[PDB]
Amino acid sequence: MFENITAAPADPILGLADLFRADERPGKINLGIGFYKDETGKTPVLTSVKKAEQYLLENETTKNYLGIDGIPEFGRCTQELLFGKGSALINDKRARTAQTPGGTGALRVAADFLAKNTSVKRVWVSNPSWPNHKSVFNSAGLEVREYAYYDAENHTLDFDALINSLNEAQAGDVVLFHGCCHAPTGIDPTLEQWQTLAQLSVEKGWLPLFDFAYQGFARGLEEDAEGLRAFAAMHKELIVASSYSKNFGLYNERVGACTLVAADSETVDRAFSQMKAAIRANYSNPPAHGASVVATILSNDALRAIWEQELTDMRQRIQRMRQLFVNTLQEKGANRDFSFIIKQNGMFSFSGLTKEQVLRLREEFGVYAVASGRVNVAGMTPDNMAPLCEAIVAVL
Amino acid sequence: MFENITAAPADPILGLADLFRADERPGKINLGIGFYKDETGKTPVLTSVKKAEQYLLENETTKNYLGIDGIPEFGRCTQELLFGKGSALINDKRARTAQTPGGTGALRVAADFLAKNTSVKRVWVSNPSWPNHKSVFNSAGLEVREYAYYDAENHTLDFDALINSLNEAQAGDVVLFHGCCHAPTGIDPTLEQWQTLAQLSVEKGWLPLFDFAYQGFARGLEEDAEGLRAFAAMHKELIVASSYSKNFGLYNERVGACTLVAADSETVDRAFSQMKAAIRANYSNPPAHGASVVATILSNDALRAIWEQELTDMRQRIQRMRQLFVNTLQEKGANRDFSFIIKQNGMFSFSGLTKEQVLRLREEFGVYAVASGRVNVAGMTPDNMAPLCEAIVAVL
Ligand SMILES: *Cc1c(COP(=O)(O)O)cnc(C)c1O
Ligand SMILES: *Cc1c(COP(=O)(O)O)cnc(C)c1O
């Protein structure tokens, strides 16, 4: 039965992880990680979550199943974070939120719901984009298409190419957008661009699907939601897959949400019932722990204040490293421009290095990066900054 | 887009839950729950898990992503629980285990892996069976077929009808088996029957898929694995979806495993890589909490001893209620036989009541049961036993 099953393709980032471990060299740096690290090169569990976990340990009386859509407070809290405390979408009750196993799980339930309950056949993804996108949509039976986004030459958002390729999308096609901190470029549309993208979206009849995994990492919680809120003000329907893996440092507890927005409550309720049928046929109901921690933090003034402070700390550290990187390279004698690094958001960016450069950088200096030249800024610390930049300068 | 989406069918057990809440009557009993309850009608978090959770709270240093297959110790521990501490399957390394979001999630990843990596098209399910089975398999694109199992007249396993209908299954067809405490009948094959079922299974070329959600609820941890171990000794390949929701009282933390067994390590590794690709396209990686709690209990002699004692306590309570039920009915004057209740395992059984009987039992006595006459024995307490049986006798 399984005797002729061909092996699945080796995951390139996992392959890197191994090579890094097996590296005897002491001064090795790893910039192809995919998560946050502080100045110590550690990914601690936030103090606000430790507090919330002590609270749960002392107050939980049962581990009985949650409803299909999860914890009610968690849903309410994510909707406000997404649309604003007094949004009409919330007052008119046009949105329903289902707690899912992480942001990836939210995308998959959207995919299954979309594929079995609507007429969608294609999903438009940016080029480049977070790698796992295709497989999620493709396993649900949807076809994936790509629209232009990155300008390799000038290192920016090729708005023209974006809009041009996106016009080949037909009405009823789903268009996926990164809410903020676009992965892997760190380049986000400006507000005016989001506004024209929403208006255009309405004319052509796209079904927007927002992947929101870094709210709080670009400018702030509310600032980062601006784009989505520009779309939500104009659209009668949309879907948003959110993740709390990075902003709450809860990676392994799988906490995210899938929010559906329809023209009215009657329609959102009917559509939501099918989204619940999709969940039931998958994992039945969601993991309480991680989501329970998020709901108690967000609903407690004291705990939320601490959390918000921890998040800005992370944001600022990343903002600090991008700046340090740029001018440390500018000190070692770069005779090349890397100033674009300061204009990008989140922990990712394309360094502009070639595969051969990243390869010798690894074998000759122990600096590990992804073949595409993608580097994670959270892998840089004010201590490894000098040896890093010297290696960069040596291969330029 | 969603404007013409038809609502999903109302879940009958959820509908019951509501009617029960809205019942003004004081002496109401609920036998259509689906989970365990102690003498107080409560579903507490076990003492061993509370201890393990205190341990984690004080020892966790990061919430970073687990590997696709989850915690390594958790996998090792479930394999021993399943196949025995020194099984050849473990020594020869023919099995790989992936931690999944609950037992339902294990079935879904098996479904997706099966549908996209093999030639399976049909899955044979017992009649009756746990309701959600069909949707899991059907959403993965597999067709579901049913084999006979229950003998309504004599209230037992219709082995003849079972084997007879199962011969229409072709080679390469998956046959689903409940490891123990068959839901919803509580009727399990005897060892000799499991042995003939395994031998037969080998001749016809079925791919056995075991759904193991109640290990420890029939006779004991090892006793309950006998059937699976009879099959594993003869088969070169099989799949087992396990759940820790009921035996660890961890319902909402979604903890289960999907174990793949192949002829050798080389083949199980190659097949397992595709199972991991399937997980990646779904929820990416599993929820650490619930599974972390299970792994620390199972690997600690002290904590495991307490847990094993808590599990037998649950088993015994259920065994006590079945006995009490039978002779309390036999005291109120039943002039009918319910002795079969004592011969069934787990918390479920068909009472033998008709839909009209269960209906008037509800509206006239406040005793809520499923339309099929299925009752949950854990909903009975030595305190509600008399009023329960009086209602039963009144509608007979
Ligand atoms: C992290 C991430 C996700 C999914 O994350 P989970 O870890 O599954 O919550 C989805 N999309 C993007 C762009 C991400 O960065
Ligand atoms: C409880 C159960 C499952 C799945 O349970 P989870 O709650 O998802 O772990 C699967 N099959 C049967 C027969 C069950 O009783």
Side-chain angles (χ1 to χ4, degrees):
Chain A
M1 202 83 227
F2 321 131
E3 302 304 304
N4 237 222
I5 282 184
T6 186
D11 206 332
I13 102 156
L14 279 180
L16 252 190
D18 295 344
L19 298 170
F20 190 66
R21 296 181 296 102
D23 196 71
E24 66 287 312
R25 287 171 298 175
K28 58 179 178 181
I29 307 178
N30 185 349
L31 302 169
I33 46 181
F35 49 83
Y36 181 78
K37 279 183 174 178
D38 56 20
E39 305 259 299
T40 325
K42 229 81 67 55
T43 314
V45 11
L46 304 184
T47 298
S48 48
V49 334
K50 271 293 187 193
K51 288 176 113 56
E53 291 188 288
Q54 179 78 42
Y55 178 69
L56 295 181
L57 181 55
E58 297 178 308
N59 281 92
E60 275 186 341
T61 62
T62 186
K63 290 288 191 182
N64 218 114
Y65 297 114
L66 292 181
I68 304 303
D69 51 339
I71 306 172
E73 260 243 84
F74 175 81
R76 142 276 191 227
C77 287
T78 107
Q79 287 189 13
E80 286 181 34
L81 245 190
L82 262 37
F83 311 121
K85 302 81 210 86
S87 175
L89 277 78
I90 305 179
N91 292 332
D92 298 354
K93 255 311 88 206
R94 290 172 53 209
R96 287 303 300 134
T97 296
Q99 176 193 324
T100 59
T104 304
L107 290 166
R108 168 60 96 107
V109 327
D112 289 340
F113 157 79
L114 243 35
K116 316 324 297 167
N117 293 284
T118 76
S119 57
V120 328
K121 309 300 168 194
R122 329 216 75 137
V123 179
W124 291 79
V125 153
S126 60
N127 172 42
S129 196
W130 174 63
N132 193 28
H133 278 147
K134 306 227 166 158
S135 23
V136 174
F137 299 117
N138 279 175
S139 60
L142 298 175
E143 300 176 276
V144 174
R145 283 296 197 95
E146 295 180 315
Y147 58 88
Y149 193 81
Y150 185 54
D151 183 0
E153 297 178 61
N154 293 43
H155 302 111
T156 186
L157 211 203
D158 203 341
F159 205 52
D160 296 309
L162 194 172
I163 273 199
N164 279 359
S165 59
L166 219 39
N167 275 225
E168 204 215 321
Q170 302 147 35
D173 269 3
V174 177
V175 178
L176 177 74
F177 286 107
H178 288 228
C180 70
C181 294
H182 176 94
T185 68
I187 303 158
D188 301 318
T190 182
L191 180 47
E192 293 188 52
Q193 288 173 336
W194 274 127
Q195 274 163 241
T196 86
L197 236 30
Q199 206 161 265
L200 172 65
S201 178
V202 181
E203 300 185 280
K204 323 304 280 288
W206 312 147
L207 193 243
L209 203 188
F210 271 88
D211 180 3
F212 222 162
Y214 299 100
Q215 194 184 5
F217 279 97
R219 273 132 67 239
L221 289 175
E222 302 294 274
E223 291 70 27
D224 294 5
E226 274 180 0
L228 164 66
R229 299 177 184 186
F231 272 71
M234 295 190 219
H235 290 257
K236 311 212 76 59
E237 298 169 331
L238 60 70
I239 302 165
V240 30
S242 38
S243 172
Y244 287 106
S245 296
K246 297 108 183 194
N247 60 9
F248 274 81
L250 286 169
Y251 307 97
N252 70 19
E253 301 291 0
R254 316 310 292 132
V255 50
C258 182
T259 305
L260 247 183
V261 174
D264 46 71
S265 49
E266 204 288 299
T267 182
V268 74
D269 283 347
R270 257 170 48 234
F272 197 54
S273 70
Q274 291 292 2
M275 180 172 265
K276 291 200 289 182
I279 290 161
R280 199 206 303 137
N282 193 348
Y283 53 81
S284 206
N285 45 78
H289 191 74
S292 214
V293 166
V294 175
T296 111
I297 284 171
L298 296 189
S299 58
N300 181 331
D301 310 282
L303 247 19
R304 187 184 180 128
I306 295 167
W307 167 61
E308 286 194 30
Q309 188 44 238
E310 300 190 272
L311 181 56
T312 94
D313 277 350
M314 298 180 138
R315 178 166 71 251
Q316 284 178 203
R317 168 171 142 75
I318 294 165
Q319 287 175 337
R320 223 117 300 177
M321 289 304 101
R322 305 183 73 99
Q323 303 184 89
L324 232 203
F325 182 59
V326 175
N327 51 235
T328 295
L329 278 168
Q330 268 64 89
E331 275 181 26
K332 301 293 182 180
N335 295 349
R336 190 177 206 170
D337 209 66
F338 279 86
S339 317
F340 56 89
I341 294 292
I342 308 301
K343 318 306 171 290
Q344 299 160 168
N345 308 307
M347 42 192 113
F348 302 109
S349 275
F350 279 139
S351 53
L353 258 44
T354 68
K355 62 177 172 292
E356 296 82 24
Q357 282 175 326
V358 322
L359 188 85
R360 69 173 295 207
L361 204 55
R362 179 200 316 153
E363 300 239 2
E364 292 162 50
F365 302 102
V367 173
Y368 291 65
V370 187
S372 51
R374 195 193 81 229
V375 301
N376 186 330
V377 159
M380 308 171 162
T381 67
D383 276 316
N384 67 16
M385 200 59 81
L388 204 201
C389 296
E390 286 169 348
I392 304 306
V393 172
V395 304
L396 252 50
Chain B
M1 202 83 227
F2 321 131
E3 302 304 304
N4 237 222
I5 282 184
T6 186
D11 206 332
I13 102 156
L14 279 180
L16 252 190
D18 295 344
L19 298 170
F20 190 66
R21 296 181 296 102
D23 196 71
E24 66 287 312
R25 287 171 298 175
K28 58 179 178 181
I29 307 178
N30 185 349
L31 302 169
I33 46 181
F35 49 83
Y36 181 78
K37 279 183 174 178
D38 56 20
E39 305 259 299
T40 325
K42 229 81 67 55
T43 314
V45 11
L46 304 184
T47 298
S48 48
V49 334
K50 271 293 187 193
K51 288 176 113 56
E53 291 188 288
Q54 179 78 42
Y55 178 69
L56 295 181
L57 181 55
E58 297 178 308
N59 281 92
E60 275 186 341
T61 62
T62 186
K63 290 288 191 182
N64 218 114
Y65 297 114
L66 292 181
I68 304 303
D69 51 339
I71 306 172
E73 260 243 84
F74 175 81
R76 142 276 191 227
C77 287
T78 107
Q79 287 189 13
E80 286 181 34
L81 245 190
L82 262 37
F83 311 121
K85 302 81 210 86
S87 175
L89 277 78
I90 305 179
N91 292 332
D92 298 354
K93 255 311 88 206
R94 290 172 53 209
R96 287 303 300 134
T97 296
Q99 176 193 324
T100 59
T104 304
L107 290 166
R108 168 60 96 107
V109 327
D112 289 340
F113 157 79
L114 243 35
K116 316 324 297 167
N117 293 284
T118 76
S119 57
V120 328
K121 309 300 168 194
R122 329 216 75 137
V123 179
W124 291 79
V125 153
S126 60
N127 172 42
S129 196
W130 174 63
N132 193 28
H133 278 147
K134 306 227 166 158
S135 23
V136 174
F137 299 117
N138 279 175
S139 60
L142 298 175
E143 300 176 276
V144 174
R145 283 296 197 95
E146 295 180 315
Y147 58 88
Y149 193 81
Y150 185 54
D151 183 0
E153 297 178 61
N154 293 43
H155 302 111
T156 186
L157 211 203
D158 203 341
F159 205 52
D160 296 309
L162 194 172
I163 273 199
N164 279 359
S165 59
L166 219 39
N167 275 225
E168 204 215 321
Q170 302 147 35
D173 269 3
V174 177
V175 178
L176 177 74
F177 286 107
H178 288 228
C180 70
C181 294
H182 176 94
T185 68
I187 303 158
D188 301 318
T190 182
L191 180 47
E192 293 188 52
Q193 288 173 336
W194 274 127
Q195 274 163 241
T196 86
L197 236 30
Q199 206 161 265
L200 172 65
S201 178
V202 181
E203 300 185 280
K204 323 304 280 288
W206 312 147
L207 193 243
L209 203 188
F210 271 88
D211 180 3
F212 222 162
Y214 299 100
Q215 194 184 5
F217 279 97
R219 273 132 67 239
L221 289 175
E222 302 294 274
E223 291 70 27
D224 294 5
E226 274 180 0
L228 164 66
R229 299 177 184 186
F231 272 71
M234 295 190 219
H235 290 257
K236 311 212 76 59
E237 298 169 331
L238 60 70
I239 302 165
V240 30
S242 38
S243 172
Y244 287 106
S245 296
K246 297 108 183 194
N247 60 9
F248 274 81
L250 286 169
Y251 307 97
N252 70 19
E253 301 291 0
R254 316 310 292 132
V255 50
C258 182
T259 305
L260 247 183
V261 174
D264 46 71
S265 49
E266 204 288 299
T267 182
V268 74
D269 283 347
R270 257 170 48 234
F272 197 54
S273 70
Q274 291 292 2
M275 180 172 265
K276 291 200 289 182
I279 290 161
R280 199 206 303 137
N282 193 348
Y283 53 81
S284 206
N285 45 78
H289 191 74
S292 214
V293 166
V294 175
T296 111
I297 284 171
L298 296 189
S299 58
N300 181 331
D301 310 282
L303 247 19
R304 187 184 180 128
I306 295 167
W307 167 61
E308 286 194 30
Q309 188 44 238
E310 300 190 272
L311 181 56
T312 94
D313 277 350
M314 298 180 138
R315 178 166 71 251
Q316 284 178 203
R317 168 171 142 75
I318 294 165
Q319 287 175 337
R320 223 117 300 177
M321 289 304 101
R322 305 183 73 99
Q323 303 184 89
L324 232 203
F325 182 59
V326 175
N327 51 235
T328 295
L329 278 168
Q330 268 64 89
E331 275 181 26
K332 301 293 182 180
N335 295 349
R336 190 177 206 170
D337 209 66
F338 279 86
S339 317
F340 56 89
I341 294 292
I342 308 301
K343 318 306 171 290
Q344 299 160 168
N345 308 307
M347 42 192 113
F348 302 109
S349 275
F350 279 139
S351 53
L353 258 44
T354 68
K355 62 177 172 292
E356 296 82 24
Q357 282 175 326
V358 322
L359 188 85
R360 69 173 295 207
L361 204 55
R362 179 200 316 153
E363 300 239 2
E364 292 162 50
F365 302 102
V367 173
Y368 291 65
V370 187
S372 51
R374 195 193 81 229
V375 301
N376 186 330
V377 159
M380 308 171 162
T381 67
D383 276 316
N384 67 16
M385 200 59 81
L388 204 201
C389 296
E390 286 169 348
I392 304 306
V393 172
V395 304
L396 252 50

